[PDB]
């Protein structure tokens, strides 16, 4: 972040500022003034393009170009590291559970995200594999339990419909006595119906209305 300004500030305030102030005229600690001014005049005379304020801008741009060409290799090699399940491949709710604050919990989207995460530090790899297996078993048991709950709900619906129907058709609160004596109401029914067949065997003695009686019996016992 802002490396060009740091390079140019290094070039200006550390390289040119030290090679100009005391690197030219303050060399007389080991020494008169005339020979030091002559050598300083020759030095600033036969140098006046290298330490300009416009050549060092080009050198700063060249140093930035070198560091950008070295940063390019590091950026294209920093994405080819050990990836370890990166983003854009998990589900929506998984990568919302990563960042925190989901604000809306669901079960269908969580199931569709858990049944989508891939498979494979090695102890953490085994722990993640066991956790993936456990969560997939959670989703399997969730779907099986939901289907069995719908089936048992329809079952209790039919049971409650039968009990409400017999309570309305009886209106006497004798539901337990209804099933126990259902055999009793049927043994007196077929015994009394045999008396009607005995009264219709050799009393009418017909042959054309017998077909109508047989059709009425076989269409009332079936329709």
């Amino acid at each position: 972040t802002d490396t060009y300004n740091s390079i140019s500030n290094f070039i200006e305030n550390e390289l040119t500022a030290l090679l100009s102030s005391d690197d030219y005229l303050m060399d007389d600690l080991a020494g008169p003034n005339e020979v030091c001014r002559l050598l300083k005049a020759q030095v600033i005379e036969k140098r006046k393009d290298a330490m300009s304020r416009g050549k060092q801008d080009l050198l700063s741009k060249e140093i930035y170009d070198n560091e950008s060409e070295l940063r390019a290799s590091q950026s294209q090699q920093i994405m080819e590291l050990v990836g370890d399940i990166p983003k854009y491949s998990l589900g929506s709710e998984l990568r919302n559970r990563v960042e925190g604050e989901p604000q809306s919990t669901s079960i269908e989207r969580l199931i569709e995200d858990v049944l989508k995460l891939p498979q494979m530090d090695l102890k953490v790899l085994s722990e993640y594999s066991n956790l993936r297996k456990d969560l997939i078993l959670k989703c399997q048991a969730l779907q099986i339990g939901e289907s069995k709950l719908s089936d048992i709900l329809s079952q209790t619906n039919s049971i409650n419909s039968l009990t409400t129907s017999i309570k309305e058709a009886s209106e006497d609160d004798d539901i337990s006595e209804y099933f126990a004596t259902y055999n009793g109401k049927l043994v007196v029914a077929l015994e009394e119906m045999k008396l009607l067949l005995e009264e219709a065997v050799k009393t009418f003695g017909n042959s054309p209305e017998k077909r109508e009686k047989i059709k009425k019996i076989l269409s009332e016992l079936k329709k």
């Binding site: 619906n157 409650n160 419909s161 039968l162 409400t164 129907s165 329709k223």
Partner: protein
């Protein structure tokens, strides 16, 4: 000229003077589209209608005659408001004793539209079910023994031994509002039952891939397995 068309008029004079996009006012053609095309095999007949002083009573009975052998009837009685038209009360006078427990939990929604549509779609679904099952009778009576069970909800075929039961259950709604069908199969190889999950996957694949009328015939072809 200028004409004033009415409800009862011939179609040619209706079509001469037709420059709007409104429905045709011919009541016989409109009742023909309402009766022969959108709701076939249904005999609606209004029995009586009275009024008070502001409401209008209306007794109408239906006869769902898609099954011609033993159709079930029902009879309604509705109470209007006849201006700012709401529906105050509606009650059921008589039901033919065949759908009476099936239309017991359904007829407590206090929504007559859902009960009418559910009864019509239920008898249509029952007619399609007995058609599919009778088609499976007619193509298997010479090779196997094939008898029905319960009421009609599970056809059973048997050969050599090996048995196969094809469930077809229609569940009326109660505690969507249209009746739904459920198809499940179960095999027996003489000894014991097979795995229900593998049979459910095979049935789901063979019905999702082929169909319902031609899908179950493939299931009987696999349960034969003398040739392939």
């Amino acid at each position: 000229r200028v004409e004033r068309i009415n409800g009862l008029t011939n179609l040619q004079k209706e079509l001469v003077t037709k420059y709007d996009t409104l429905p045709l006012l011919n009541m016989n053609l409109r009742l023909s589209y309402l009766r022969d095309h959108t709701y076939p095999h249904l005999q609606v007949s209004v029995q009586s209608r009275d009024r008070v002083h502001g409401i209008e009573v209306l007794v109408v009975n239906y006869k769902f005659c898609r099954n011609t052998m033993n159709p079930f009837e029902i009879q309604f009685k509705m109470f209007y408001k006849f201006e700012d038209s709401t529906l105050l009360k509606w009650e059921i006078l008589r039901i033919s004793t065949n759908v009476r427990l099936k239309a017991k939990q359904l007829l407590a929604t206090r929504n007559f539209q859902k009960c009418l549509l559910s009864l019509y779609e239920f008898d249509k679904i029952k007619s399609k079910k007995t058609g599919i099952f009778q088609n499976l009778i007619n193509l298997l009576k010479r090779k196997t023994r094939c008898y029905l069970m319960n009421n009609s909800d599970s056809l059973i075929v048997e050969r050599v031994t090996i048995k196969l039961q094809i469930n077809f259950i229609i569940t009326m709604p109660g505690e969507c509002f249209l009746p739904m069908s459920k198809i499940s199969i179960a095999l027996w190889k003489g000894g014991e039952r097979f795995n229900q999950i593998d049979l459910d996957e095979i049935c789901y694949g063979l019905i999702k891939e082929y169909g319902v009328k031609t899908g179950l015939k493939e299931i009987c072809n696999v349960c034969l397995f003398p040739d392939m």
